[PDB]
Ligand binder design. Structure first.
Ligand SMILES: *[C@@H]1O[C@H](CO)[C@@H](O)[C@H](O)[C@H]1NC(C)=O
Ligand SMILES: *[C@@H]1O[C@H](CO)[C@@H](O)[C@H](O)[C@H]1NC(C)=O
Ligand SMILES: *[C@@H]1O[C@H](CO)[C@@H](O)[C@H](O)[C@H]1NC(C)=O
Ligand SMILES: *[C@@H]1O[C@H](CO)[C@@H](O)[C@H](O)[C@H]1NC(C)=O
Ligand SMILES: *[C@@H]1O[C@H](CO)[C@@H](O)[C@H](O)[C@H]1NC(C)=O
Ligand SMILES: *[C@@H]1O[C@H](CO)[C@@H](O)[C@H](O)[C@H]1NC(C)=O
Ligand SMILES: *[C@@H]1O[C@H](CO)[C@@H](O)[C@H](O)[C@H]1NC(C)=O
Lengths: 1002, 48
């Protein structure tokens, strides 16, 4: 019996109140829409695995289910709890109660506490010794199974038992319906409401929907492509390949030699052709101290080194810390110096008994006098008499004459720090010699075309092992790449060149439409060949979920290498070669011309992010909010945060400058006339409404309505509030309605809007006569086009993309700064009052310094990110200023600069930190085929038009403008005489009618 | 030049490739991987 666990099992990971915020945590929940087992309560209590937890639910009418026993043995062998409610008392004890032969309740006593219509959910668990009683009682009208619905599960009481539970058995009442979901260490997108009840949850490691849900930090994901994690072909097994060494290495010889050298003449016993286990080393408990500097003290047995040195010399107990990098003293400067980059491991075992004669060990020497400090890993055998005083010796005593070497008298009667030792500093080195000293770990066969865990002679990695033709020289052993990582190795048992290449990997991206549209799931494996992973293979990779379609459509969710996915028909996810458009060959010839008989005025919403929220952080408040110590430690960095404050205030001032250049190019106050007799062009939707309490446009109202702190970082209010930004926009609209381009240049010249469209028509090379000829028609088209703007701008959220995304981008920038106030950066806490209130000041410089280098580096990424973001905003804002100057404040002849089509004008509209332009453009609609010739020959002379294109419908020749079909007879006030008809190719016979001819003939 | 090479360099595998311990210590830095991956993704969709 199986059940779909619809929505049940969500509880509080913590009981800290949150409002309208989605918190992601790793915790133990059962998955949503998963498989759970269904039980009855007739005549069943097997001991199910409570590996980390289950969710219980009861359909109850007479209170039969009354208790539980949880544990690891559950038989009074371990500490196991029992629950009974005798109608007056709650009794939860783990004490040694007498349990029945079959455990029921009727119808090591360390924890020293001694005293359908209802769905009951109880989760008894242990996390870190806390015992959380989770309870919820919920009324329903349902009888068939567990209901569909959301129920937060809250803690009540925490008790001190802290019990291991790995498998559990339910408790019956004798004279239990439940569900078992295996919890996993999964990450969960949790939603809190303003009243503090968890209303929803997502197990987000389950399906592509949920993976997008917790990577986008939202319960509703837009239709698009989203990378969620990384796919790596996991190694199925481990291959070890080491040389066929057959001899146990004399490590025991340099431990158990009959004599050891002094520090004056310590030996270099060099090692090759060996096996080093180090397990006997760790199994020996003789080690008095084991300060292992380059490599792990414990984790060394599996590791393989290239060469090893046993630097055996006897030195005192207090001096064992002087065998260390950076150490100084008599021995460290005169006998044996370790480099600051010493890569190895130091050995010293408890050894008072062996290298110590009972009458005194006199054979160990050391140097106490030398004119200069010694070098790392050199050997000085020199015995020259040290010069101390002034006069020299010819082999006599006196001044300047002591032997620079003198010995220790090693007796067992010495002090405890003065005791003799067999200290033997096995100076390990990791170099790149031929690696010989490997842990045994018997070898396996060489797999091919399958990436596994390889360890070739101490070199580890993940990849496939293939044969190569790479001709090694016999001394050479390893291969490298341009990126100096390992390219090839030779198998040290069989002399073969093995190429190493890590297998197919890469991030996983997810194709998913809107959750308001679909819940069908899809996954994408890019640059993975469809072996190692309704499956499609393309050049971009292995695509699983979408059926491959030979028919081509327009790209909705891009995949890669020309593949795009979408949601269509019954609807489904499809994968296809994306269309480059409709496949439309042109009807070219030497004499084929197409000129439009019809046009339309299309309006396009080029929306541009012009400005940003003037965020300004404080050296004091943001970085070190209300902390004298942290403010002092930031001024410890000098002027560093001061140029950051300078830079952010500069971003504020240049944002004001962007807004000033796009809006306060105007020098005066322009206001709209009380009558809107605009020649048929009603602007009450784009112009401010006097009936509105704030004098803004209606489309601006839907730009304010449909599209729309105190903790150390503030927002500076704009120099220009929203209402008077709207006032500047109204000024620009008024100037470009009654004054057009003139007020941008100089004095305000009142010009009608009909004139502005008519003269703007001339700009793009279409004649203004068409405008006054179809004034009513284009008034209808332009008004209904602005109405289509109103409808689209009120219906599609995607129409505000380029401002919604940038306002969101600033929101995520600020939000990541906010999230760094949770980030620890290696410090033990992230709230500065917490870290200061519990750290003593001397270690608080260290903790605060880690926290502020993390905070300042994150803030540095932030301020550089908004420096380049304000550079992008300022580039688009100089683009917006030139756009307004040449497209609002004048007419631009730049084709495709003011939206698609022949630009006419543009209308500014204020928006939250942005400008929406209503670019009116000329777009041709319907065209006809005509026959064309380069020139017309009339009386032996070739004719070329001053304006427009020669055309013929096949019966009569006409000249017409390049963007609208206006046929007129070829006239010499539209053409000119030039050249002769014998040179130009493609010229045709015709007659050209001079308008002077009827005047002179009449 | 109209585009760069569309490098999609992932934070966790570039810094701590085929490693769990380093990725666990790196996620303890907070968000640097998610804004770095979002930055690279923004770069890639910017070339697109
Ligand atoms: C949460 O609490 C408020 C305050 O009384 C209440 O009015 C509301 O109905 C509660 N439930 C919600 C918001 O779902
Ligand atoms: C050692 O390994 C080589 C691998 O080429 C093999 O030919 C040889 O027989 C091995 N010898 C022993 C004693 O295992
Ligand atoms: C993908 O794997 C198939 C399976 O043999 C192979 O034939 C094909 O060549 C592979 N694709 C590429 C691009 O190598
Ligand atoms: C050309 O097509 C447009 C499309 O709406 C129409 O309004 C206009 O009247 C047409 N002109 C002629 C001359 O047919
Ligand atoms: C104003 O525009 C509306 C469009 O909703 C139109 O119905 C109305 O006739 C226009 N008024 C004037 C005076 O042009
Ligand atoms: C190219 O133009 C010449 C002169 O107009 C014409 O004779 C010839 O047929 C044209 N080529 C084609 C393929 O029509
Ligand atoms: C007409 O054009 C032809 C070239 O095709 C040229 O030879 C002739 O002189 C032109 N004029 C006439 C026939 O009057």
């Amino acid at each position: 019996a199986y059940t779909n666990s619809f929505t049940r099992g969500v509880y509080y990971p913590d009981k800290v109140f949150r409002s309208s915020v989605l918190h992601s945590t790793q915790d133990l929940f059962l998955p949503f829409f998963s498989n759970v087992t269904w039980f009855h309560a007739i005549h069943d209590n097997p001991v199910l695995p409570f590996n980390d937890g289950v969710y219980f639910a009861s359909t109850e009418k007479s209170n039969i289910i009354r208790g539980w026993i949880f544990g690891t043995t559950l038989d009074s062998k371990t500490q196991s709890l029992l629950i009974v409610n005798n109608a007056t008392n709650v009794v939860i004890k783990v004490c040694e109660f007498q349990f029945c032969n079959d455990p029921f309740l009727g119808v090591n006593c360390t924890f020293e506490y001694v005293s359908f219509k209802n769905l009951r959910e109880f989760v008894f668990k242990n996390i870190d010794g806390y015992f959380k009683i989770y309870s919820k009682h919920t009324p329903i009208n349902l009888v068939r199974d567990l209901p569909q619905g959301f129920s937060a599960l809250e803690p009540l009481v925490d008790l001190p038992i802290g019990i291991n539970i790995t498998r559990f058995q339910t408790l019956l009442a004798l004279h239990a319906a439940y569900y078992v979901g295996y919890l996993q260490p999964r990450t969960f997108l949790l939603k809190y409401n303003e009243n503090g009840t968890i209303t929803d949850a997502v197990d987000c490691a389950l399906d592509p929907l949920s993976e997008t849900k917790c990577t986008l930090k939202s319960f509703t994901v837009e239709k698009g492509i989203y990378q969620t994690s990384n796919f790596r072909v996991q190694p199925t097994e481990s291959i070890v390949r080491f040389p066929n060494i057959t001899n146990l290495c004399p490590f025991g010889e340099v431990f158990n030699a009959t004599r050891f050298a002094s520090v004056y003449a310590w030996n270099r016993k060099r090692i090759s052709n060996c096996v080093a286990d180090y397990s006997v080393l760790y199994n020996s408990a003789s080690f008095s101290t084991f300060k292992c500097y380059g490599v792990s003290p414990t984790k060394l047995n599996d590791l393989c080194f290239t060469n090893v040195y046993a630097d055996s010399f006897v030195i005192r107990g207090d001096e064992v810390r002087q065998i260390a990098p950076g150490q100084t003293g008599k021995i460290a400067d005169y006998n044996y110096k370790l480099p600051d980059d010493f890569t190895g491991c130091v050995i010293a075992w408890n050894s008072n008994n062996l290298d110590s004669k009972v009458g005194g060990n006199y054979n160990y020497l050391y140097r106490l006098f030398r004119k200069s400090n010694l070098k790392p890993f050199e050997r000085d055998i020199s015995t020259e008499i040290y010069q101390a005083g002034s006069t020299p010796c010819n082999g006599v005593e006196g001044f300047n004459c002591y032997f620079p070497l003198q010995s220790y008298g090693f007796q067992p009667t010495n002090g405890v720090g003065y005791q003799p030792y067999r200290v033997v500093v096995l100076s390990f080195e990791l170099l790149h010699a031929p690696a010989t000293v490997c842990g045994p770990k018997k070898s396996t066969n060489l797999v091919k075309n399958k990436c596994v865990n390889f360890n070739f002679n101490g070199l580890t990695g993940t990849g496939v092992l293939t044969e190569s033709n790479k001709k090694f020289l016999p001394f050479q052993q390893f291969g490298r790449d341009i990126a100096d990582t390992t390219d090839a190795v030779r198998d040290p048992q069989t002399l073969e060149i093995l190429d190493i290449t890590p297998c197919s990997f890469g991030g996983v991206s997810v194709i998913t439409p809107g959750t308001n549209t679909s819940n069908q799931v899809a996954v994408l494996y890019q640059d993975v060949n469809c072996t190692e992973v309704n499956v499609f293979q393309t050049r971009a990779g292995c695509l699983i979920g979408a059926e491959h379609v030979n028919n081509s459509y327009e790209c909705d969710i891009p995949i890669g290498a020309g593949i795009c996915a979408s949601y269509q028909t019954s609807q489904s996810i499809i994968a296809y070669t994306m269309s480059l458009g409709a496949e439309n060959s042109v009807a070219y010839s030497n004499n084929s011309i197409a000129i439009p008989t019809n046009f339309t005025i299309s309006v396009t919403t080029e929306i541009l992010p012009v400005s940003m929220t003037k965020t300004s952080v404080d050296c004091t408040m943001y970085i070190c909010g209300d902390s004298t110590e942290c403010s002092n430690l930031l001024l410890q960095y000098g002027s560093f945060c001061t140029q950051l404050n300078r830079a952010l205030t500069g971003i504020a001032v240049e944002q004001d400058k962007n807004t000033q250049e796009v809006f306060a190019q105007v020098k005066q106050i322009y206001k709209t006339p009380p009558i809107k007799d605009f020649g048929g062009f009603n602007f009450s939707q784009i112009l401010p409404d006097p009936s509105k309490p704030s004098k803004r446009s209606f489309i601006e109202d839907l730009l304010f309505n449909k599209v729309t702190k105190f903790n150390g970082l503030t927002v500076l209010p704009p120099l220009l509030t929203d209402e008077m930004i709207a006032q500047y926009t109204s000024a620009l609209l008024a100037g470009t309605i009654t004054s057009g381009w003139t007020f941008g240049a100089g004095a305000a010249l009142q010009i009608p809007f009909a004139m502005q469209m008519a003269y703007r028509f001339n700009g793009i090379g279409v004649t203004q006569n068409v405008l006054y000829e179809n004034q009513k028609l284009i008034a209808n088209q332009f008004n209904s086009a602005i109405g289509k703007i109103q409808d689209s701008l009120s219906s599609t959220a995607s129409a505000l993309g380029k401002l919604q995304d940038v306002v969101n981008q600033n929101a995520q920038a600020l939000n990541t700064l906010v999230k760094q106030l949770s980030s620890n950066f290696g410090a033990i806490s992230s709230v500065l009052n917490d870290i200061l209130s519990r750290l003593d000041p001397p270690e608080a410089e260290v903790q605060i310094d880690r926290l502020i280098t993390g905070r300042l580096q994150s803030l540095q990424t932030y301020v550089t990110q908004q420096l380049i973001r304000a550079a992008e905003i300022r580039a688009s804002a100089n683009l917006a200023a030139t756009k307004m100057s040449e497209c609002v404040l004048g007419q631009s002849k730049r084709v495709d600069f003011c939206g698609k089509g022949y630009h006419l004008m543009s209308f500014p509209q204020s928006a939250p930190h942005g400008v929406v332009f209503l670019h009116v453009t000329y777009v041709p609609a319907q065209e006809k085929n005509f026959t064309t010739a380069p020139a017309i020959c009339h009386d032996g002379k070739a004719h070329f038009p001053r304006e427009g294109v020669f055309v013929s419908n096949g019966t009569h020749w006409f000249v017409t403008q390049r963007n609208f079909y206006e046929p007129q007879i070829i006239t010499t006030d539209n053409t000119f005489v030039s050249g002769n008809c014998d040179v130009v190719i493609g010229i045709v016979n015709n007659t050209v009618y001079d308008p002077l001819q009827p005047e002179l003939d009449s």
